[PDB]
PDB file of C-alpha atoms (C1' of nucleotides) in Angstrom:
ATOM      1  CA  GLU A   1     -27.105  38.878  13.432  1.00  0.00           C
ATOM      2  CA  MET A   2     -28.409  35.987  15.618  1.00  0.00           C
ATOM      3  CA  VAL A   3     -24.799  34.918  16.523  1.00  0.00           C
ATOM      4  CA  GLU A   4     -23.795  38.458  17.305  1.00  0.00           C
ATOM      5  CA  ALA A   5     -26.922  38.777  19.544  1.00  0.00           C
ATOM      6  CA  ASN A   6     -26.344  35.518  21.335  1.00  0.00           C
ATOM      7  CA  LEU A   7     -22.545  35.942  21.870  1.00  0.00           C
ATOM      8  CA  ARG A   8     -23.546  37.450  25.222  1.00  0.00           C
ATOM      9  CA  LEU A   9     -25.612  34.455  26.140  1.00  0.00           C
ATOM     10  CA  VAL A  10     -22.632  32.223  25.078  1.00  0.00           C
ATOM     11  CA  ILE A  11     -20.211  34.153  27.318  1.00  0.00           C
ATOM     12  CA  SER A  12     -22.755  33.993  30.185  1.00  0.00           C
ATOM     13  CA  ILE A  13     -22.936  30.170  29.849  1.00  0.00           C
ATOM     14  CA  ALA A  14     -19.154  30.197  29.802  1.00  0.00           C
ATOM     15  CA  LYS A  15     -19.056  32.124  33.003  1.00  0.00           C
ATOM     16  CA  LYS A  16     -21.607  29.763  34.505  1.00  0.00           C
ATOM     17  CA  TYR A  17     -19.339  26.891  33.454  1.00  0.00           C
ATOM     18  CA  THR A  18     -16.134  28.400  34.611  1.00  0.00           C
ATOM     19  CA  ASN A  19     -13.804  25.368  34.621  1.00  0.00           C
ATOM     20  CA  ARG A  20     -10.158  25.646  33.833  1.00  0.00           C
ATOM     21  CA  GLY A  21     -10.106  22.642  31.423  1.00  0.00           C
ATOM     22  CA  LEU A  22      -7.933  23.564  28.479  1.00  0.00           C
ATOM     23  CA  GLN A  23      -8.648  27.325  28.214  1.00  0.00           C
ATOM     24  CA  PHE A  24     -11.593  29.717  28.336  1.00  0.00           C
ATOM     25  CA  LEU A  25     -11.033  30.618  24.696  1.00  0.00           C
ATOM     26  CA  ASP A  26     -11.490  27.059  23.583  1.00  0.00           C
ATOM     27  CA  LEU A  27     -14.619  26.793  25.669  1.00  0.00           C
ATOM     28  CA  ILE A  28     -16.018  30.015  24.160  1.00  0.00           C
ATOM     29  CA  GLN A  29     -15.293  28.737  20.620  1.00  0.00           C
ATOM     30  CA  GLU A  30     -16.995  25.443  21.446  1.00  0.00           C
ATOM     31  CA  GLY A  31     -20.001  27.333  22.799  1.00  0.00           C
ATOM     32  CA  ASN A  32     -20.071  29.412  19.592  1.00  0.00           C
ATOM     33  CA  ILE A  33     -20.007  26.289  17.421  1.00  0.00           C
ATOM     34  CA  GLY A  34     -22.778  24.828  19.491  1.00  0.00           C
ATOM     35  CA  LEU A  35     -24.766  28.019  19.121  1.00  0.00           C
ATOM     36  CA  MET A  36     -24.337  27.971  15.303  1.00  0.00           C
ATOM     37  CA  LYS A  37     -25.352  24.274  15.164  1.00  0.00           C
ATOM     38  CA  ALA A  38     -28.456  25.048  17.163  1.00  0.00           C
ATOM     39  CA  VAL A  39     -29.389  28.097  15.042  1.00  0.00           C
ATOM     40  CA  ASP A  40     -28.992  25.906  11.897  1.00  0.00           C
ATOM     41  CA  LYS A  41     -31.844  23.745  13.321  1.00  0.00           C
ATOM     42  CA  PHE A  42     -33.911  26.097  15.417  1.00  0.00           C
ATOM     43  CA  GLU A  43     -37.476  27.138  14.693  1.00  0.00           C
ATOM     44  CA  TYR A  44     -39.878  29.596  16.421  1.00  0.00           C
ATOM     45  CA  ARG A  45     -43.016  27.453  15.808  1.00  0.00           C
ATOM     46  CA  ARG A  46     -42.521  25.713  19.215  1.00  0.00           C
ATOM     47  CA  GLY A  47     -43.557  28.887  20.997  1.00  0.00           C
ATOM     48  CA  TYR A  48     -40.705  28.553  23.512  1.00  0.00           C
ATOM     49  CA  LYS A  49     -37.536  30.556  24.216  1.00  0.00           C
ATOM     50  CA  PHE A  50     -34.380  30.013  22.191  1.00  0.00           C
ATOM     51  CA  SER A  51     -32.316  30.476  25.340  1.00  0.00           C
ATOM     52  CA  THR A  52     -33.088  26.937  26.656  1.00  0.00           C
ATOM     53  CA  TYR A  53     -32.304  25.253  23.306  1.00  0.00           C
ATOM     54  CA  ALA A  54     -29.127  27.172  22.855  1.00  0.00           C
ATOM     55  CA  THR A  55     -28.062  26.380  26.506  1.00  0.00           C
ATOM     56  CA  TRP A  56     -28.670  22.654  25.935  1.00  0.00           C
ATOM     57  CA  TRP A  57     -26.749  22.663  22.663  1.00  0.00           C
ATOM     58  CA  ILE A  58     -23.835  24.628  24.295  1.00  0.00           C
ATOM     59  CA  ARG A  59     -23.794  22.214  27.261  1.00  0.00           C
ATOM     60  CA  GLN A  60     -23.671  19.230  24.938  1.00  0.00           C
ATOM     61  CA  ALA A  61     -20.856  20.809  22.939  1.00  0.00           C
ATOM     62  CA  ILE A  62     -18.845  21.658  26.005  1.00  0.00           C
ATOM     63  CA  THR A  63     -19.286  18.118  27.384  1.00  0.00           C
ATOM     64  CA  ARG A  64     -18.123  16.576  24.156  1.00  0.00           C
ATOM     65  CA  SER A  65     -15.110  18.938  24.044  1.00  0.00           C
ATOM     66  CA  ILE A  66     -14.134  18.263  27.654  1.00  0.00           C
ATOM     67  CA  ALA A  67     -14.649  14.502  27.114  1.00  0.00           C
ATOM     68  CA  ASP A  68     -12.559  14.436  23.903  1.00  0.00           C
ATOM     69  CA  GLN A  69     -10.063  17.329  24.230  1.00  0.00           C
ATOM     70  CA  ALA A  70      -8.618  18.966  27.360  1.00  0.00           C
ATOM     71  CA  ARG A  71      -6.554  15.892  28.115  1.00  0.00           C
ATOM     72  CA  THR A  72      -3.242  14.250  27.013  1.00  0.00           C
ATOM     73  CA  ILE A  73      -4.808  10.905  26.174  1.00  0.00           C
ATOM     74  CA  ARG A  74      -8.135  10.571  24.333  1.00  0.00           C
ATOM     75  CA  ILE A  75     -10.845   9.169  26.560  1.00  0.00           C
ATOM     76  CA  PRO A  76     -14.235   8.264  25.059  1.00  0.00           C
ATOM     77  CA  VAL A  77     -17.426   9.943  26.253  1.00  0.00           C
ATOM     78  CA  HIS A  78     -18.812   6.790  27.770  1.00  0.00           C
ATOM     79  CA  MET A  79     -15.703   6.194  29.873  1.00  0.00           C
TER      80      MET A  79
ATOM     81  C1'  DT B   1      69.296 -79.412  13.222  1.00  0.00           C
ATOM     82  C1'  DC B   2      65.458 -80.864  10.144  1.00  0.00           C
ATOM     83  C1'  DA B   3      60.421 -81.968  10.514  1.00  0.00           C
ATOM     84  C1'  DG B   4      54.979 -83.002  12.055  1.00  0.00           C
ATOM     85  C1'  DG B   5      51.801 -79.991  13.926  1.00  0.00           C
ATOM     86  C1'  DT B   6      48.629 -76.631  15.834  1.00  0.00           C
ATOM     87  C1'  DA B   7      47.854 -71.431  15.824  1.00  0.00           C
ATOM     88  C1'  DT B   8      46.913 -67.696  12.656  1.00  0.00           C
ATOM     89  C1'  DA B   9      45.608 -65.488   7.950  1.00  0.00           C
ATOM     90  C1'  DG B  10      43.947 -65.164   2.882  1.00  0.00           C
ATOM     91  C1'  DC B  11      40.743 -67.149  -0.404  1.00  0.00           C
ATOM     92  C1'  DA B  12      35.576 -69.106  -3.201  1.00  0.00           C
ATOM     93  C1'  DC B  13      30.676 -68.503  -2.635  1.00  0.00           C
ATOM     94  C1'  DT B  14      24.949 -67.640  -2.067  1.00  0.00           C
ATOM     95  C1'  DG B  15      22.001 -64.916   0.543  1.00  0.00           C
ATOM     96  C1'  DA B  16      20.641 -61.988   3.881  1.00  0.00           C
ATOM     97  C1'  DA B  17      21.476 -56.301   5.245  1.00  0.00           C
ATOM     98  C1'  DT B  18      21.661 -51.491   3.673  1.00  0.00           C
ATOM     99  C1'  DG B  19      20.335 -47.023  -0.085  1.00  0.00           C
ATOM    100  C1'  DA B  20      17.326 -44.383  -2.749  1.00  0.00           C
ATOM    101  C1'  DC B  21      12.635 -42.709  -4.181  1.00  0.00           C
ATOM    102  C1'  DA B  22       7.898 -42.087  -3.390  1.00  0.00           C
ATOM    103  C1'  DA B  23       3.269 -41.837  -0.621  1.00  0.00           C
ATOM    104  C1'  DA B  24       0.311 -41.279   3.634  1.00  0.00           C
ATOM    105  C1'  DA B  25      -0.275 -38.978   8.297  1.00  0.00           C
ATOM    106  C1'  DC B  26       0.310 -35.533  12.187  1.00  0.00           C
ATOM    107  C1'  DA B  27       1.637 -30.941  14.158  1.00  0.00           C
ATOM    108  C1'  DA B  28       2.922 -25.806  13.502  1.00  0.00           C
ATOM    109  C1'  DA B  29       1.611 -21.551  11.131  1.00  0.00           C
ATOM    110  C1'  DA B  30      -0.957 -18.174   8.291  1.00  0.00           C
ATOM    111  C1'  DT B  31      -5.571 -16.985   6.527  1.00  0.00           C
ATOM    112  C1'  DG B  32     -10.487 -16.487   6.743  1.00  0.00           C
ATOM    113  C1'  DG B  33     -15.386 -16.727   9.184  1.00  0.00           C
ATOM    114  C1'  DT B  34     -18.031 -15.183  13.307  1.00  0.00           C
ATOM    115  C1'  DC B  35     -19.640 -13.075  17.994  1.00  0.00           C
ATOM    116  C1'  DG B  36     -19.924  -9.296  21.310  1.00  0.00           C
ATOM    117  C1'  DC B  37     -17.928  -4.729  22.720  1.00  0.00           C
ATOM    118  C1'  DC B  38     -15.948   0.237  21.650  1.00  0.00           C
ATOM    119  C1'  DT B  39     -17.054   3.938  19.624  1.00  0.00           C
ATOM    120  C1'  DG B  40     -18.771   8.119  16.261  1.00  0.00           C
ATOM    121  C1'  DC B  41     -22.839  10.903  15.656  1.00  0.00           C
ATOM    122  C1'  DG B  42     -27.526  13.081  16.659  1.00  0.00           C
ATOM    123  C1'  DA B  43     -31.170  14.853  20.038  1.00  0.00           C
ATOM    124  C1'  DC B  44     -33.444  16.323  24.861  1.00  0.00           C
ATOM    125  C1'  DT B  45     -38.007  22.816  23.954  1.00  0.00           C
ATOM    126  C1'  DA B  46     -39.980  26.500  31.475  1.00  0.00           C
ATOM    127  C1'  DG B  47     -36.163  30.709  32.031  1.00  0.00           C
ATOM    128  C1'  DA B  48     -31.335  31.207  32.347  1.00  0.00           C
ATOM    129  C1'  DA B  49     -27.746  37.300  28.155  1.00  0.00           C
ATOM    130  C1'  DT B  50     -19.929  40.933  29.794  1.00  0.00           C
ATOM    131  C1'  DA B  51     -19.280  38.682  35.797  1.00  0.00           C
ATOM    132  C1'  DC B  52     -16.461  34.932  35.990  1.00  0.00           C
ATOM    133  C1'  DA B  53     -11.600  34.394  35.316  1.00  0.00           C
ATOM    134  C1'  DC B  54      -9.607  36.090  39.996  1.00  0.00           C
ATOM    135  C1'  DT B  55      -4.068  38.822  41.710  1.00  0.00           C
ATOM    136  C1'  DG B  56       0.776  37.722  44.835  1.00  0.00           C
ATOM    137  C1'  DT B  57       5.824  39.139  41.313  1.00  0.00           C
ATOM    138  C1'  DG B  58       6.404  42.017  46.044  1.00  0.00           C
ATOM    139  C1'  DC B  59       9.730  48.042  45.056  1.00  0.00           C
ATOM    140  C1'  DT B  60      17.243  43.586  43.913  1.00  0.00           C
ATOM    141  C1'  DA B  61      21.351  45.795  40.716  1.00  0.00           C
ATOM    142  C1'  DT B  62      22.153  48.237  37.581  1.00  0.00           C
ATOM    143  C1'  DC B  63      22.665  48.431  31.916  1.00  0.00           C
ATOM    144  C1'  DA B  64      21.408  49.460  27.497  1.00  0.00           C
ATOM    145  C1'  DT B  65      17.290  50.787  23.303  1.00  0.00           C
ATOM    146  C1'  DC B  66      13.290  52.729  21.345  1.00  0.00           C
ATOM    147  C1'  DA B  67       9.288  57.025  20.779  1.00  0.00           C
ATOM    148  C1'  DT B  68       7.146  61.590  23.150  1.00  0.00           C
ATOM    149  C1'  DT B  69       8.492  66.588  25.704  1.00  0.00           C
ATOM    150  C1'  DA B  70      10.785  70.813  25.778  1.00  0.00           C
ATOM    151  C1'  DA B  71      13.339  74.131  23.446  1.00  0.00           C
ATOM    152  C1'  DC B  72      17.738  76.071  20.459  1.00  0.00           C
ATOM    153  C1'  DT B  73      17.713  77.585  15.789  1.00  0.00           C
TER     154       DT B  73
END
DNA sequence: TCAGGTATAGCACTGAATGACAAAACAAAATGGTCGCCTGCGACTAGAATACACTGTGCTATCATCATTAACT
């Protein structure tokens, strides 16, 4: 239920990060994976909004995916 | 023309030269110890919710294959 509710937030972040990269579908899948990984560790005791945490996790996932994938040769994240 | 002789070659003989085996030393190569960098993984808590991809081949020249429309039976 949380994933189905936040799919719209995921696609909104994807639209805010509209780069060609590999493909929009791969970026949406990476955002969904990041959303799931954030939900698996999220709690409401902080008294803040889940939107910021989910956005940070999706940004990290997209950065890792564009640093590793979306290229012929594999380039590390530090490079 | 026959013969003494000097030039040239074979023969008797100890002792120095030349073979075979083993050991010590140096250089080339593979294996192992060690240092610093590359890299794989996790976390950062104000709010951010289908609008950003975007289109552009252009309507050539016909030719043949598949379900819906209309109507004869």
